[PDB]
Amino acid sequence: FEMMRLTINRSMDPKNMFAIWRVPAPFKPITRKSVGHRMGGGKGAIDHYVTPVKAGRLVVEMGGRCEFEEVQGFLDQVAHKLPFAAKAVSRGTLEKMRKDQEERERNNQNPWTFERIATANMLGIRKVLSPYDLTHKGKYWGKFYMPKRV
Amino acid sequence: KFTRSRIPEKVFQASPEDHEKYGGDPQNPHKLHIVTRIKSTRRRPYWEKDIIKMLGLEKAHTPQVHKNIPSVNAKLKVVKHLIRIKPLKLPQGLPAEENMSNTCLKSTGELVVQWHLKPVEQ
Amino acid sequence: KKSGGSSKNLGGKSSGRRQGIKKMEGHYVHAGNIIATQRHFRWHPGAHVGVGKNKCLYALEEGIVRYTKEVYVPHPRNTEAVDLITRLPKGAVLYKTFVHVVPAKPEGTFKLVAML
RNA sequence: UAGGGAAUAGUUUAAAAAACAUCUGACUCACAUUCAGAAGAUGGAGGUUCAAUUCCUCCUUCCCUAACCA
RNA sequence: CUCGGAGCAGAACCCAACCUCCGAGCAGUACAUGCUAAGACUUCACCAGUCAAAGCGAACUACUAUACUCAAUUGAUCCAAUAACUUGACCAACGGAACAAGUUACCCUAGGGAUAACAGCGCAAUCCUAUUCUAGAGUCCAUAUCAACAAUAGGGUUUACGACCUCGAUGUUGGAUCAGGACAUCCCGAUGGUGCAGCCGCUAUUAAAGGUUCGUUUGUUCAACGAUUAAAGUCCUACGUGAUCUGAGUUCAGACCGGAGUAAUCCAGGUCGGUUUCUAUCUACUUUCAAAUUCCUCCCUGUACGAAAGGACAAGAGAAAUAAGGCCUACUUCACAAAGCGCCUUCCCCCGUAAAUGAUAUCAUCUCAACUUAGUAUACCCACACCCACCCAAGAACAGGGUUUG
RNA sequence: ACCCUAACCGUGCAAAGGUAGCAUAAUCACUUGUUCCUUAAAUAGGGACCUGUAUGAAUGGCUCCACGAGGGUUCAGCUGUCUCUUACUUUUAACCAGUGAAAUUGACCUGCCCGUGAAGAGGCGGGCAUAACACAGCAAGACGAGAAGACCCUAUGGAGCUUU
RNA sequence: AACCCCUAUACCUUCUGCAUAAUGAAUUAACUAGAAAUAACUUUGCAAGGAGAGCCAAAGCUAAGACCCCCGAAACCAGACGAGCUACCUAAGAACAGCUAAAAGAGCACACCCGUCUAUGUAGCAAAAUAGUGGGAAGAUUUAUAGGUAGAGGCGACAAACCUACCGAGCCUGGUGAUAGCUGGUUGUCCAAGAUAGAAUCUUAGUUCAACUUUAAAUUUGCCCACAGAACCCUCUAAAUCCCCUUGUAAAUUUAACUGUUAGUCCAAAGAGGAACAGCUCUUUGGACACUAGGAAAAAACCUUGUAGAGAGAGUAAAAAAUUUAACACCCAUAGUAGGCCUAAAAGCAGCCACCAAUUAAGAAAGCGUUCAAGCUCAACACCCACUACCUAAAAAAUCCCAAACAUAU
RNA sequence: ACCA
Ligand SMILES: C[NH+](C)c1cc(NC(=O)CNC(C)(C)C)c(O)c2c1C[C@H]1C[C@H]3[C@H]([NH+](C)C)C(O)=C(C(N)=O)C(=O)[C@@]3(O)C(O)=C1C2=O
Ligand SMILES: [K+]
Ligand SMILES: [K+]
Ligand SMILES: [K+]
Ligand SMILES: [K+]
Ligand SMILES: [K+]
Ligand SMILES: [K+]
Ligand SMILES: [K+]
């Protein structure tokens, strides 16, 4: 948050730009054990806090009397420094991003899609899939998002 | 947790295109299935091992005939990844007491009631 | 090498109570059969179903177990439940799940014992 | 690192008192002693209890012990 | 350390953790909280625990009643007390031995790699490196240098963590000896940048052929200090190497001081003393290999370069040291000889870049364009008796040389 | 009483409140204190000072003659301890002749490199090497040999010792 | 055709798992290890009785068959035997040169006694030695002889010393085949069924019950599963489950009788702890392994695959790693004006506000710049097409790279 | 008073 704030506030035009947080402040406690301790002896003590973020979420939102080109530069800098894959997007680039994914799902010439096979348990494939894979449809592997997967 | 799987019923709703590829008649469904196990039950959960035994499919590549009815289809749906299902075809009708001893189940799924082991004269 | 701490959470070692339905829909019960055990009222007694002092639902007659959804009307002496319904918006009716036993046999028959 | 104990007037000890310090006066030529008055605290926060100086739980704080065998 | 409730464990039941939370070891009302009896539940066994129609007695006309509220609110058998009814454990290590603590380095046996200490392995939080980002510092200037917040990738040197091989033994910290390897380069070579005038620096690219001191101190690794040095590199090799050595340390039995304990004893707190076995069966290896490195002086030159102060470089010439390889004339230890402290000899390369010409892209452009430049061994060994014996600068034996000294 | 320390002041507590001495070390948080000697250089040794987590008076305290195969420091000399080894003698050795043990040993037709694997391979995978057999050396490996690990843990296994 | 070719990780034990560099084993011969009741079962006899007094009998009862190892501690106790060693003591002996000093537990130094340090030796010469160097050597000395003290003990200038070569308590015999929840052993052939929820426990290296597993018996459903049905508090509104006729199937329960298994690994999935480490630890649902075969290089746990023999037939399963990357416009620039304000000064470019006009066109200015200046680009004009693809950007360890190779025939 |  310190990196996001100082970089955005230092790089924005306060007269013609505003910025709002789209994530809450750290609220999830994270415990750590004393250095050098062995396994066991009860859970460790609360150390710091974090905010969970899922793929497809807006982290920070900007607007004002600017175009996308004006903010895309330093929004990409802050995004590149985030602990996950992130990207500066616009009201328009976000929509075309979603139209392109739906266009690919429609013109896909492969008769075999992850979803079709996994929903019908074809090949008994669910013996290697998570229950979550019925809705993730092969686009998610842990915390990673794969925009190429259809 | 790995569990038994519910298959959406849409999976078993054939489309007009499917009838063209495979050549079934939705208005005149076949009576009997030909079912062949083509895949091991090793490395499969026990409940699939059990249904393969109920269907008489313990030996691979060994055609069993079964009724094309909802109860049997319920079992065949659980092990549909272990098996090949084909319709039984009776180009010459059912065997009769006369020709019970002359049938052959051909690879095309047709049960012929006359098996001469001779070349077709024409 | 390092001295370690200790967990401050004691207790929590009781095992499951093994409570729940003992007789599902359509099952044949004899009088006395415990139909379901519970700690709170998930299922309420209906026709020919008694309740023990631990909220145990049991069969009072011999027959078939049914579960239904019925309108719930508390006893006017049950202050807490009556306080609930009095605050409900007009037109709102509470429902609970009830279990019943449909008796299978008649109470008896009239048979000829003498011709005197 | 891990356990235990302890925070009461400005001070030091009690179970909300006492002696000091302070304040007011008296005595003295003056000061001190002395005499007579007066104020002055339950570490903070969080509770319960009919009522919290012995009770919480936490914080803050200081201490005590232990930290061994290869 | 027993018992309940909640989560983990979302929906029949069940479900672990030195997991996350919260509770109980009672109170209160009764005095039919009397008797009896179908059918059932059940804490995964058992024991124990639970619910209940009908009936008998009661009670009885408006939630109560043949089974009180309440979640746990609890303890078997034996035995004891009692006329009988009935009563008795924080038996809390809570399925409960009727009643028993310490200490052992004076120790012993049985086992265990089911389990720790060494090493290996896993892992990489911690450590270390690189890159990405542009805040910031650097007078100005983000990028000569140095860097916050972060981000990504790597390494396997630390401290841990895990407990997978070895407890019918994988003994040893530091040192000696001999060193194999990495390159993340300390020095020597070649480059690029510079807040590079020069002399020195700083930073990066390339380079592992060659090298990388002696002392005082501590058992020491570490460090400090004295002298040097071109430089006194970082690491791995079972913290390389103990059937090669050492044993200061370390860590058994003896003893002392301080502390702890009633005492026996104990204390990664000090202190003094304390047995280091092995005849090599197998593998491996035993003249790779004759190309050499570095400093210094002179000189260039008080030149280049600088306002001065200062002050060099691919050359040129010497003289050394070390490392290899020999040798004995002299010296020295010695003496038909072997030696060093003495003497003699020692011979190529390396790539980072910097530049021409020049298209894709009619200029330019050193070019994962075609292209042109810097800029790619020799020496040694070598013929084959008898295989009597003798001799030898040859040699463990064998082999070799000589005998026209049998 | 600048700080340091407190002759001093207040209060409390105990049976008594550690006296005399002694203290950078058989003693040691900081610490290799500091200072004076000692060396070119000292985490050593000596003399002092600081002052005691936890020095201290027959559990003896503090000095001192003599003494000690005790532990430590040192002048001078001495020397192969070392720089840095060399030479010779005997022993051993090796060869001939005689006599003739031991531990050890699953079987062995018993290479190297990388990888793998019960996580460190002569024996597995992929490569590479490769006629056969004596003798002398060597000690890197054969987790070499020797002793059912003396460490550590476990066993309702022992034993010695001490006790409220 | 002996070898060359191809295939092939001794064995036993122990383990989650052993080619393991874990145990044991030179080899040969011989020796060397499952002992029995209760009940049940099977097969006879007799049968409301049986039995050759006793004891059983509501089909019993008699008889028979068939059944439960080996080696190993450290210890504990009883009674003997031990002081020719050694500890201490008693009686009665013996030795101690020379030199110095002269009171002598004085000095030097032999014999003699001891054992400091070094080396050697380590199945030795020796179950403690040898060589040198040492300490003492008229004394609390050393030593010959005989005798004494005895293991719950002695003796001790305490080292827990020594008491006949291992004394925290001797040795021998006996109790004694001590005991061992612990390790190691456990002997002919062939077939078959067979992998593990939990509870309690001075218990977690073990037991007992359950569970699973085996055998025999009885008689009847078992498994798979259709609707209908199983909660609110309040949803991560989960994958699922439970119940369950049909159906496909052949099991299931009960009765009798037992033992062994109750130290578990990886993989996928849902979680928990740890560091969203671990070949980590803990629950759960599956799978695999601890059982063959073929793949993934070797390879327990991934993929294919199961039922057994012979064949010099055949179809198949799983099964081989792909990828190559950063060029980029050319020109052109006058003017109100240094817009005011601010500021010592600000002139496009400190900061403040405003941002209009000139010429076809050039922002009261986007980036650099300075002395606030000046300068240098960019945005305009003119000429007139630069080619612009699409997103992109990495690497180092330690014995020695690692099959050989190959872009072309359906 | 306090054995189990
Ligand atoms: C950590 N502290 C508690 C401590 C520790 C040690 N030593 C050890 O812990 C040694 N530990 C081993 C045994 C090595 C494991 C210690 O040795 C000491 C001390 C405390 C100091 C106090 C010192 C203090 N001043 C001078 C700084 C002071 O005022 C006093 C006092 N009495 O008031 C001191 O005496 C003091 O100088 C001192 O002596 C201390 C220690 O000695
Ligand atoms: K071991
Ligand atoms: K030793
Ligand atoms: K000292
Ligand atoms: K000093
Ligand atoms: K001495
Ligand atoms: K060796
Ligand atoms: K191994």
Ligand SMILES: [K+]
């Ligand atoms: K092993």
Ligand SMILES: [K+]
């Ligand atoms: K072993």
Ligand SMILES: [K+]
């Ligand atoms: K064993």
Ligand SMILES: [K+]
């Ligand atoms: K046990």
Ligand SMILES: [Mg+2]
């Ligand atoms: Mg001792």
Ligand SMILES: [Mg+2]
């Ligand atoms: Mg032992």
Ligand SMILES: [Mg+2]
């Ligand atoms: Mg292990």
Ligand SMILES: [Mg+2]
């Ligand atoms: Mg380790």
Ligand SMILES: [Mg+2]
């Ligand atoms: Mg190892």
Ligand SMILES: [Mg+2]
């Ligand atoms: Mg390592």
Ligand SMILES: [Mg+2]
């Ligand atoms: Mg484990």
Ligand SMILES: [Mg+2]
């Ligand atoms: Mg061994």
Ligand SMILES: [Mg+2]
């Ligand atoms: Mg080397």
Ligand SMILES: [Mg+2]
């Ligand atoms: Mg080492």
Ligand SMILES: [Mg+2]
């Ligand atoms: Mg010992």
Ligand SMILES: [Mg+2]
């Ligand atoms: Mg003392």
